[PDB]
Amino acid sequence: APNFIVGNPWDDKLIFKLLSGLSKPVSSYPNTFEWQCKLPAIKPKTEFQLGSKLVYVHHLLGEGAFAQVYEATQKNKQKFVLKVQKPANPWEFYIGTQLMERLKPSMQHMFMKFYSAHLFQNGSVLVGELYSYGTLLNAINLYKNTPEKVMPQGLVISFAMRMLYMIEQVHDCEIIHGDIKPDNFILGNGFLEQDDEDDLSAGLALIDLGQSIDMKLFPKGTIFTAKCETSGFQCVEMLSNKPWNYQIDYFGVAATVYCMLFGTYMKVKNEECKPEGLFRRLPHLDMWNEFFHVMLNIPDCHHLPSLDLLRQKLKKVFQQHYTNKIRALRNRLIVLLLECKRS
Ligand SMILES: COc1cnccc1Nc1nc(-c2nn(Cc3c(F)cc(OCCO)cc3F)c3ccccc23)ncc1OC
C-alpha cells in the first residue's frame, strides 16, 4: 500500500516527461497529422484550411487558458467542433485516446466522439463531435429566468445518476477527469431525441481533459498533493492540506450536483465537511444529506465510496417519485434549450 507522492500531476515538466516516455507516441496515432507550418487564423465567420479540407468557423463556444473551442462546418455539410490550443496540447488527445481504448463498448455512447488531431508548429486543433445544446452551466442559468428558478429535482437526480455512472466508468479506466464542473458538461441531440422514460438522461457528455490524469502512467499507490489550477474548485483534501487522487472527481460531481440543485457554486464548511445552504425545506433532504456526506468525507485514498451504491440510493428515490414525471421535465428543458439556441 505505500504512498508514492507525485506533488503536482499537472506540472508542465511532468507532462512533457510522461508524453516523451510513451512507446506509442501521439504523433504515431493513425488520426494524428503533423503540419510544417504555423496554426492558421481561426476566427468566427471566416474560412481556414485544415490540412486538405476547407473549414468555416461559426462561433466561439468557449475559451480559457490556452484553448479556444469553436463550432464549425466542413455536398451535405456536417457540423463539428474544433478545440484550438496554443501552444499544442497533445495531452488531451492522449487521454481521450486511452479512455476510448479502455472503456467497455457499451459505455462509449456516454462520451463525445473525436476525429483527428492536427499538430502545427505553434499549436494544435482537435476535431470533435458537436453537442449543440450548450453546457450544463448554461442550462442551470436558463432556469434562473423562470418562475421555477432552479432545475426540477427529477431532472437533477436523472443527471446526477448519469454523472455517477459515467465517472464510475472513467475511474474503471484508471483516469481522473480532474475538472468536473457544470461548464464541462455538454448537452446534445441524444437528449432531444430521448423519447423513453429511462432513469439516466442521454445526450450528456463530459469534456475538457486539460486537468485529466492517467493513473496507469504512475506507480501503484500514487497520491497527489497540489491545489487546483486557476479555474478549478479546491477539493476537501486540498482545503485541509491532505493527499488526494480519485477524490478530486467525487468532489467535482458533488459541486456540479449542488449547482443543479441551488443554481450557484458550492461552498463548504466543517463540523465533518458539509455544503452551505441545504435547508430543511429541500425535497429528499435525507437523500441529499447522505449524498453530500459520502461524496465530501472520504477518509482517505483507500476508502473511496462505491459510485454504484451512491447511484442506487438516488435511483430508489427516482423510481418512487419521478418515473412518470421525467419525460415532461426533459421536454420542458428541451423547450428552454431550443429557445436559447435561437438566441
Ligand atoms: C458547448 O460546447 C461543446 C459542444 N460540443 C462539443 C464540445 C463542446 N465544448 C468543449 N469541448 C472541449 C473539448 N475537449 N476536448 C478534449 C477531448 C475530450 F473532451 C474527450 C475526448 O475523448 C474521450 C471520449 O470523449 C478526447 C478529447 F481530445 C475536445 C476535443 C475536441 C473538441 C472539443 C473538445 N472542451 C471544452 C468545451 O467547452 C468548454
Ligand SMILES: [Mg+2]
Ligand atoms: Mg479545466
